[PDB]
Amino acid sequence: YPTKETAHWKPPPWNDVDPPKDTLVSNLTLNFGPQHPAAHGVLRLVMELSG
Amino acid sequence: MWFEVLPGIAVMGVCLFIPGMATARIHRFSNGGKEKRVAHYPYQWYLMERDRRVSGVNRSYVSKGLENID
Amino acid sequence: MSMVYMNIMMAFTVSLVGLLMYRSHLMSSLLCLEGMMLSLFVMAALTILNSHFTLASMMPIILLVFAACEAALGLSLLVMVSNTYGTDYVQNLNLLQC
Amino acid sequence: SMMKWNRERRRLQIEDFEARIALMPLLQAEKDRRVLQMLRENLEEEATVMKDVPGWKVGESVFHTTRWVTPMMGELYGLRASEEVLSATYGFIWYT
Amino acid sequence: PFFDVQKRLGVDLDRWMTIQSAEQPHKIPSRCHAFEKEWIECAHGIGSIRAEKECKIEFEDFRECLLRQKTMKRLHAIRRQREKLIKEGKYTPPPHHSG
Amino acid sequence: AERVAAFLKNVWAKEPVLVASFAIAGLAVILPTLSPYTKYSLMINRATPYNYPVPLRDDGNMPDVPSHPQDPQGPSLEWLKRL
Amino acid sequence: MNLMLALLTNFTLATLLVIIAFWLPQLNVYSEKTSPYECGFDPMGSARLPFSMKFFLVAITFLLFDLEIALLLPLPWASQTANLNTMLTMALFLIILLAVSLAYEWTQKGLEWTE
Amino acid sequence: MMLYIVFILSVIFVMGFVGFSSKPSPIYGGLGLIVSGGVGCGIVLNFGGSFLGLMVFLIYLGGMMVVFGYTTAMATEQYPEIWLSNKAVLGAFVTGLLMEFFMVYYVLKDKEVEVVFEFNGLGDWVIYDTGDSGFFSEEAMGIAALYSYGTWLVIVTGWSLLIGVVVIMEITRGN
Amino acid sequence: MFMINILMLIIPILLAVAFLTLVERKVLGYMQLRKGPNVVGPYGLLQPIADAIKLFIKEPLRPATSSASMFILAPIMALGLALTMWIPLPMPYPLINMNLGVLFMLAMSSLAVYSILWSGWASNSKYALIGALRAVAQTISYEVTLAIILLSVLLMSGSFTLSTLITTQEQMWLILPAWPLAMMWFISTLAETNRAPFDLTEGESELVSGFNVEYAAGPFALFFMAEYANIIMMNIFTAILFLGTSHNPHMPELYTINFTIKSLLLTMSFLWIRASYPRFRYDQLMHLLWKNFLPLTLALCMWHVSLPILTSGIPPQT
Amino acid sequence: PGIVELPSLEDLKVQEVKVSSSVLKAAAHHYGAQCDKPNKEFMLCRWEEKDPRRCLEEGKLVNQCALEFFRQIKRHCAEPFTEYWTCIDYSGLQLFRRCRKQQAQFDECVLDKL
Amino acid sequence: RGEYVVAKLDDLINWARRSSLWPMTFGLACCAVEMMHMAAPRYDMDRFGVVFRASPRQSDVMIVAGTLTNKMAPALRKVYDQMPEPRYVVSMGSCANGGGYYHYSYSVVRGCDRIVPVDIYVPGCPPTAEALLYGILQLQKKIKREKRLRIWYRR
Ligand SMILES: COC1=C(OC)C(=O)C(C/C=C(\C)CC/C=C(/C)CC/C=C(/C)CC/C=C(/C)CC/C=C(/C)CC/C=C(/C)CC/C=C(/C)CC/C=C(/C)CC/C=C(\C)CCC=C(C)C)=C(C)C1=O
């Protein structure tokens, strides 16, 4: 029984599997140096970290 | 030399000795020269609250011997 | 029914009302489930300890054991929700329509 | 060594418990009089406080049975000072 | 129980903790042991329909022991009356009730 | 007996912590069922008098119940004083 | 009374030390001084961003094992019972099942952190 | 007065509940549940159960430590909400304290209050038992009976914890 | 006289912590072929006094991005809880005599973790956050092992009372019957105190300063004071647990001298270890205690439940 | 319903045993050997009657026999007993272990003189 | 007298600050190698109370040991700014003093004193470990002669 509310409803996938969402992995960027004991003084190591 | 490290250990040792000594001596002073009564279970607490009443001065560490029965 | 039972029973009601009114985070609602278990533990422990119901003294412990299972189970589902949408928002959990 | 000393510790415990078992008849007899004395003192004082209340019956029981019911803390220390009520209620739990 | 496997098999799975007047470690009694025992023995084998009316006296005493509603009301009246008399200087507390 | 010895040596060379764990746990399960002293642990616990020994009303027909604590009747703890 | 007074003294001393720290010294506050520290260069993003937990499975398992200490800690009192045969059986059964849980997760690569 | 310590702890117990029930950032909600766990331990500990009070505090201290790690991984945003940053959070926080105030105000004034049940305001100390136990802790003897009396409880809880580990691995496998 | 007893506990503790910093710098110095503090005072005896004054007259800063109430609550909680773990310790008489003292210390040690988590989170800094989440991993690593190691020992003592451990070791130290448990316990106190080789919450060479990277002046000193008061306490706990001292009720001072020496030596071993070993990776610390200590602790827990039963050596309940 | 019946203060009047807990514990073993019959009589009354009001008379004979017990110690073993319970009184736990030498002196006096 | 008291308080805080100097763990170039040898056993800067700490928020002294380039200059100012006061800067070596061997380079800052204030200049290329230690003990004497409280007392 179509209504205004259910006009944009569409039948679910034939196998219950929805498409995976667009990659939104947010890696953490960290300045490892230069003022860092293990950076040997003048190294600015920009690291993408996951955990 | 290494024995120049000892003065810093002696001061540290004296500081660790005081807490134990102070508690031991303060308990004696607060319980008439005896160990503070240990009451881990109600029976021991029941006897300590009976000591207060028997003492007649509201102190559980004041003992009453055979001189108080006649 | 002393004045302590009022606050304990009010704590359960607050955590129940807190669980039934979601804001956004699934984690915020999981805390309300663990809050409700805490109220039930305290209320049961008080009644058992006051009535000297000796054997019932283990019931509050058995109540915490199964509160952890639910809490761990709720966290495991929260991991999979986060892995699918990048957040623990409950508004994303709407693919299934009543 | 550990199991030989623990075995000796169990015998020292039985001796300690038998010392209590020797005193319990004396302690129980004293406690019974102490509880009955306190209840009577509350009854002799409920009479004066509640002399004017219309329907009050001094010493009325809340139970249908005539069996002896162990008084709870409120009944026994109903009218006594807060100092002794504090020690009779939380004295043990707070003694550390 | 919906299925009474315990009763037939003769195995006691959870009956040992159902009541507070049952056997306890070191024979430690519950505060309302006598009241529960009386209500249980009065209402044994007669069904809850009859016990709800024929064992009403024992069950009301049992509830009084459990929650102490009537005792606390009685204490409240005595305490409230004493304050009224004292507030209007009409009653002197005795020594053993003060120290 | 040759192939089994190979398994034990292999684990003893690669997981010595686990070999000690299972060996320790195996002794915990086996020795109590064999020790002759396990029965005394039960008796010592039963011999510890937490509660008061409520006396029995004497109807005149209880020959095995003592009238005084120091009477020969009743359980004896002579075994415990030597254990 | 003693325990509560001991706690009040410890956290009162802790508080008074903090108060002195903020009111005794000479302060010169300006924007660059209180900016977040990232080794000299401005942080690239917010510290409040998600931080992936690679040991999430082991952290959930900690919740279940942390409840075994609640069940195991009564053992010293449990050993005082007259039912030693039953008590020792259920003590070992409970510990063994705790060990089988560890074995299952270990063998199924559950204790290995995610890549 | 110290005679109302249990009641005073139960007021903080509710205030902590309003802390996380208003649902701010789970970081601050976790703090609220720790305060309630701490005072809840105090309340139980004053009725004669020291093991139960210390145990629930111990379990919830580890419980919220895992929750803290999960909050920085999966329940965090750029501006974590405090009890003042949001009208919905602030509205529910002020409402909870006001109801606590009125219930506390009426119980301490009338010595009674009727909400579903009838509560008595004389003080929690009036219901304590006047007899002493023996040479043991009744709470400790009851908890130690789990292994001699609670054979069936040990099996079901033991099996539940075992299956709990199997289940969480299955749920989080992802394939 | 009870307030005087409290002050006669915390004040000497704060003095011992102050001079443990001197003792560590000189012991590390001589194990590194140098001297350490010897200029400020005779043999460096005034170095702790100079450091305390310097830190408390220095400017403390609240970072612009910090959560102030939690940022300032954390140092207060750390020092308040490090002083609270001394009140049940029998030396030989506890200030607060608890029937469940072992449980109380466990509960307080789990609550003191949040002085790290809230410190690191409230700072709103990436290195403070990485440091805070290393404390979550560390606690997940040792908590289960630590509690069951205590339980195994308490099955030979028979109670959770700390003063009972004195009676248990009246004939012999518990190091002999429980040397395997003493080894794991010692390592677990290193992990629990965030000490090298398990100093990961700070991890100087990796996280600059870890959870307290943003702390300055007095607030930093409170974290440092809490850190050093814990290692002394965790070694007093070890001496009571495994190196029991004889208690003569007429000479309670002899216990204190002998008990103090063992605590100093165990504390010196912490400094000895910090000079000798590298640092674990914090995922390697988790595998150390879950794959090696936990399998052994579970086995030893079963062994110590059965050994008293099969030898008729169950300790008394009271 | 009904009035709770209580004894008068004259029915509860009796000569108390005013000795501290250390005195009682020092003499407990001998006390339980000599005063068994009045003790066990009173203790049977409490468990059978279940009412402290029904065992007041038995509860007085417990007091009467305990006094006579200490009077006999006060006549023959006054000095050894005082040393014994002074040493038990010193310990916080009132341990028997630490007073064996003083216990022996108290045990031998009663054995010979009583 | 009030002047006497503030003089003694000044001697106390001045003593505490010069006896507990905590340099930031901050080195740029070859001059940091000579700074390592001042921490090595022969000179043992730790015995004077001088302890390195990595966090700028726990440091009292910045030793600019090496060359300062235009790329690094913003980083240096940031870490200097994040030092709680009182804070002192020691410039070590020709590069950090006035550019040294690289004075005329497109990418070198001609002296760290263009970026931060400097309290002591230690000459050399590199200064020997014993020459840096002279500058540290010269900084301590400079702190010993501060008159913070006396100047406050007569404002
Ligand atoms: C070769 O290539 C290159 C590198 O590659 C290596 C580089 O790297 C770099 C970059 C260089 C740098 C960043 C500088 C390098 C310089 C060095 C000196 C590093 C070399 C190696 C070292 C080992 C130096 C020092 C490091 C360590 C680990 C030594 C260990 C000894 C110590 C004393 C450190 C700290 C130890 C302890 C025990 C604690 C002392 C700490 C304190 C803060 C003092 C006490 C604390 C308190 C809080 C006060 C106490 C009292 C209180 C709080 C009050 C209590 C009392 C009351 C009453 C309240 C360059 C340019 C380079 O070219």
Ligand SMILES: CCCCCCCCCCCCCCCCCC(=O)OC[C@H](COP(=O)(O)OCCN)OC(=O)CCCCCCCCCCCCCCCCC
């Ligand atoms: C009566 C009650 C007491 C009995 C309780 C019953 C439960 C007992 C088990 C409880 C402990 C749970 C763990 C048991 C399983 C052992 C762990 C396991 O699953 O190992 C599987 C192992 C996987 O490793 P894999 O990747 O394949 O690489 C090595 C290959 N060789 O693959 C393998 O290769 C393993 C090979 C077989 C290992 C056998 C282990 C037997 C353990 C029990 C021995 C106990 C007796 C020993 C002590 C004797 C007494 C001193």
Ligand SMILES: CCCCCCCCCCCC(=O)OC[C@H](COP(=O)(O)OCC[N+](C)(C)C)OC(=O)CCCCCCCCCCC
């Ligand atoms: C908790 C509540 C805190 C209250 C405030 C406390 C800090 C401020 C107190 C200053 C009082 C005052 O007036 O001292 C100042 C007076 C002289 O005053 P003046 O020259 O007229 O100052 C007018 C303003 N000038 C100075 C800018 C022109 O110098 C003195 O004689 C002593 C000053 C040093 C402090 C002495 C205390 C020593 C303690 C030692 C601890 C180890």
Ligand code: SF4
């Ligand atoms: S001053 Fe000399 S030693 Fe120092 S960085 Fe420059 S070139 Fe290298």
